Design a binder for this molecule. Structure first.
Ligand SMILES: Nc1nc2c(ncn2[C@@H]2O[C@H](COP(=O)(O)OP(=O)(O)O)[C@@H](O)[C@H]2O)c(=O)[nH]1
Ligand SMILES: [Ca+2]
Length: 308
């Protein structure tokens, strides 16, 4: 008997549901998508197969009007419908934009329900742009703290970091796609780890060990070819221009390297050393390797870091 973990991605509120819509468009298989919102108009446009309208008696079908208490009460009163949607999950990713009413208030309730049901629960949330003002930032910070209390692991993306990767003309929607990559590639990295039996094998139990009840996390992937490919891919995997939690200080890392038949012992050590040197801690590594012959000169390094 083999194990095949059930993964679910849950968008909560406006930003979370747009991230879900964009991920569905990008294409993802063997992942269930759930869309949760107070805003019935936006939920009607969701591409997810499971849509949950919360708080209709409270908001009359509108959003939360920037009030986190409304988001929280909305979720609590739809608990049974949220549980039904999560049922069967082995891992749940909850994504939401903090600072509004629905995400801030409802996302921690959703995450708490998932964890109480035994699922490995990961949050990936944004903080608002500074141009949205102090009050939005303060509401968002309270949401982040509530999320921390309710998840196994949390990845925070300050939206201000998007201003570091655009030029004056980059479309807003293109910047948003860059932030979407954090969650999408983290999910895909776990999917790929579960689906393949590696020459040095890691599986969902290793994911649980690295992520259960840990706090902040980093999830990254790097791909490189040619000379110094392993160092370059490892540096890319831990590079964090959009992340609140960098690699620095990590005390546990799951690292998987995938390459073709040319994958060398020496370069696997090089990659492992990059990660641990950048952590600047004594890192408890869980190391894996997959030989994919279809790959020629490409190497892929996946990292999950916790223990901050
Ligand atoms: N990166 C990103 N940030 C978003 C997006 N949509 C909303 N935001 C951020 O999320 C915050 C909450 O917006 P929203 O999710 O629409 O509020 P809610 O629906 O009331 O929870 C905003 O203040 C923005 O900082 C998105 O698509 N991408
Ligand atoms: Ca595996």
């Amino acid at each position: 008997g083999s194990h095949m973990a059930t993964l679910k991605v849950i968008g909560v509120g406006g930003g979370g549901n747009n991230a879900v819509n964009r991920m569905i468009d990008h294409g993802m298989n063997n992942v269930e998508f759930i869309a949760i919102n107070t805003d019935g108009q936006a939920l009607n446009l969701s591409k997810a197969e499971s849509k949950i309208q919360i708080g209709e008696k409270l908001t009359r079908g509108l959003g939360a009007g920037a009030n986190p208490e409304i988001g929280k009460k909305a979720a609590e009163e739809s608990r049974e419908q949220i549980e039904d949607a999560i049922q069967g999950a082995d891992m749940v990713f909850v994504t939401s934009g903090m600072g509004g009413g629905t995400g801030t208030g409802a996302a921690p309730v959703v995450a708490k329900i998932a964890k109480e049901m035994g699922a490995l629960t990961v949050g990936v949330v944004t903080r608002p742009f500074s141009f949205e003002g102090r009050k939005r930032q303060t509401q968002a910070a309270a949401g982040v703290e509530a999320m921390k209390a309710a998840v196994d692991t949390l990845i925070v993306i300050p939206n201000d970091r998007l201003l570091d990767i655009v030029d004056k003309s980059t479309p807003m929607m293109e910047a948003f796609k860059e932030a979407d990559n954090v969650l999408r590639q983290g999910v895909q990295g776990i999917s790929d780890l579960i689906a393949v039996s590696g020459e040095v094998n890691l599986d969902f139990a290793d994911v649980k060990t690295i992520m259960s009840n840990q706090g902040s996390a980093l999830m990254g992937i790097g791909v490189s070819s040619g000379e110094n490919r392993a160092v370059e891919a490892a540096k890319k995997a831990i590079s964090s221009p959009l992340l609140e939690t960098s690699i620095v200080g990590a005390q546990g890392v799951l690292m998987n390297i995938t390459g073709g038949e040319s994958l060398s012992l020496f370069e696997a050590q090089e990659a492992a050393d990059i990660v641990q040197d950048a952590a600047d801690e004594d890192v408890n590594m869980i190391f894996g390797t997959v030989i994919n012959p279809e790959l020629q000169d490409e190497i892929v390094v996946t990292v999950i870091a916790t223990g901050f």
